[PDB]
């Protein structure tokens, strides 16, 4: 390697530790890696930034996908990659995003925790922006492939107050509460329909503060399927005609009898959680949570649902100017 080329680049290369203060500012740990709430050292602005140190050294498959896709994608409801740092000493990759104080996991947890002692307008506005973000991705042939409350961010106080940001574009290809039944019966490819089922599960959870297909923690998963049928009922032959083509169908026939779920339907489940089966919300929910993936509503069709024309209309700030009661992110002082 040419020496002058090498030192020229070493001189000019911006290093993450010189540009950003983030020591002791870790807000999350997971398979994604390490996320920090960071500020600029050369204080041109006073904005909060999210800095993610990716899992492992070098460029993983997961990291390649997120970097590749977020470099291209631009939409108000998809998180924006601001910068990439490549640290040559330790071979660590850093990704810079704008900082989201909240997400659906924590918003949902706040309301579920209150049940020992969500506004409906916020529920509609959240759903609309999720669909809008996912429609944009689907229009560009990008599947998220693991949508859940934990990776649907919501901006806190600032110029983007209450704006949804879909995050985590690293799913390159445990609990299965958001996984569509075709995956559980051995579907070989990810699809757009699979993302829409997940949005269905998320919407049910926004309405009840409860994970609809909650289950105790080889694509065939008996207990997860059992929970889905206890909520939805067991699918009729005409409801899902291509179920026979699924690799795990004989196992399903072996382990399950339709008669076990005779009194089970989404109507009766949602009736227990005080959601009206006559509501436009319920009818939209039911179309998202259709068992046969080819009979599932698309993102664009869901966005055109009369639910979103009904009062109250979805707002761009999901909190609608009202005071944010959800706490700020705590810093993690755990060793590991």
């Amino acid at each position: 390697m040419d020496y002058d080329f090498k030192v020229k680049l070493s001189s000019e290369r911006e290093r993450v530790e010189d540009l950003f203060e983030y020591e002791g500012c870790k807000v999350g740990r997971g398979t994604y890696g390490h996320v920090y709430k960071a500020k600029r050292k050369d204080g041109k602005d006073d904005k909060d930034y999210a800095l993610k140190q990716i899992e492992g050294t070098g460029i993983s498959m997961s990291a390649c996908r997120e970097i590749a896709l977020l470099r291209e994608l631009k939409h108000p409801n998809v998180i924006s990659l601001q910068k990439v740092f490549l640290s040559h000493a330790d071979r660590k990759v850093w990704l810079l995003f704008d900082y989201a104080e909240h997400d659906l996991w924590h918003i949902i947890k706040f309301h579920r925790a209150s049940k020992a002692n969500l506004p409906r307008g916020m529920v509609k506005s959240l759903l609309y922006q999720i669909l809008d973000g996912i429609h944009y991705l689907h229009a560009n042939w990008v599947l998220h492939r693991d949508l859940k409350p934990a990776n649907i961010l919501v901006m806190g106080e600032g110029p983007e107050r209450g704006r949804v940001k879909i995050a985590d574009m690293g799913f390159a290809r445990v609990t299965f509460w958001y996984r569509a039944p075709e995956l559980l019966l051995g579907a070989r490819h990810y699809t757009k329909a699979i993302d829409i089922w997940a949005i269905g599960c998320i919407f049910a959870e926004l309405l009840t503060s409860e994970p609809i297909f909650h289950c105790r923690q080889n694509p065939y998963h008996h207990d997860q399927l059992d929970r889905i049928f206890n909520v939805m009922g067991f699918p009729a032959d005409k409801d899902w005609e291509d179920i026979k083509k699924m690799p795990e169908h004989s196992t399903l026939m072996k382990d399950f009898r339709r008669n076990t779920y005779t009194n089970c339907s989404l109507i009766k489940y949602m009736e227990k959680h005080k959601v009206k089966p006559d509501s436009k919300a319920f009818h939209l929910l039911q179309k998202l949570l259709t068992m046969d993936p080819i009979k599932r509503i698309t993102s664009e069709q869901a966005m055109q649902d009369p639910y979103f024309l009904e009062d109250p209309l979805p707002t761009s700030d999901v909190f609608a100017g009202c005071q944010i009661p959800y706490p700020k992110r705590e810093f993690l002082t755990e060793e590991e």
Binding site: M1, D2, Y3, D4, F5, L9, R13, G58, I59, S60, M61, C64, R65, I67, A68, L69, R71, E72, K74, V84, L86, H88, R91, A139, N140, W141, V142, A172, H189
Partner: protein
């Protein structure tokens, strides 16, 4: 699987990596002290064939090979041949391309064995000594490649628009094999840095029609496209086949490689 299909006009490919011809020629002048314009083009044809061979060995799809070829071209579009060894850059580009295209992470043993084997079995005329690099060198080079491309990893190619055009002609069986093959050959040139891939496809399809003596003038007339730009591309393709005729890669490349500018070593 079809990620970012239809987004070209809003893409980093279009916005950052469709370069100006005179700018590209200006940055090339530092290497043109050491090599002629002819020798530089021959050298780029050579490394296109090296990347092709590497990808065939690793049993990769053509899109992965195409993407790795573009990565390589973009690097030396901006930097000198002395900056990093193209013998090292070629497998590094293939390595990064297979990740980006979701083919997989090629293993340490498989990638180095592929580079060693291909250069021994297929390019002994150009390379007397064995592949000197190890996996630590590939990973180091991957950081430089990623930095220089400004993390622009999604690349568009003429194959998808070409397939769409021949299906729209209803002439898939007759025209596709030759047109596809002419698209492969355009990677011997700078065309991928200078033109939208759909225009490269139409020029390759046009040359295939002329070769096979198929009348398609009405179909081409009905297109909404600047035909002077297509004719510019056609001239480069015809010029490519004349250089091909007059170029013996096997007889010439050892001497051309010896003439490449060498890296400055450390103190």
């Amino acid at each position: 699987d079809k990620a970012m299909a239809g987004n070209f006009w809003q893409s980093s490919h279009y916005l950052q990596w469709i370069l100006d011809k005179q700018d590209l020629l200006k940055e090339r002048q530092k290497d043109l002290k050491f090599l002629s314009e002819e020798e530089y083009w021959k050298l780029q044809i050579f490394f296109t064939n090296v990347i092709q061979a590497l990808g065939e060995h690793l049993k990769l799809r053509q899109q992965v090979i195409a993407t790795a070829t573009v990565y390589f071209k973009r690097f030396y579009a901006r930097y000198s041949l002395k900056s990093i060894d193209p013998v090292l850059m070629a497998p590094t580009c293939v390595f990064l391309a297979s990740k980006v295209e979701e083919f997989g992470v090629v293993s340490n043993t498989r990638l180095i064995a592929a580079a060693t084997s291909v250069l021994k079995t297929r390019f002994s005329y150009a390379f007397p000594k064995e592949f000197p690099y190890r996996m630590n060198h590939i990973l180091e080079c991957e950081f430089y490649l990623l930095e220089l491309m400004d993390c622009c990893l999604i690349v568009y190619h003429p194959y998808r628009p070409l397939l769409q055009y021949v299906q729209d002609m209803g002439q898939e069986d007759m025209l596709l094999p030759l047109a596809w093959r002419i698209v492969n050959d355009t990677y011997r040139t700078d065309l991928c840095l200078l033109y939208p891939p759909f225009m490269i496809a139409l020029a390759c399809l046009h040359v295939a029609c002329v070769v096979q003596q198929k009348d398609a003038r009405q179909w081409f007339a009905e297109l909404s496209v600047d035909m002077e730009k297509i004719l510019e591309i056609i001239r480069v393709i015809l010029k490519l086949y004349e250089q091909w005729k007059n170029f013996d890669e096997r007889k010439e490349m050892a001497t051309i490689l010896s003439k490449m500018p060498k890296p400055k070593p450390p103190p």
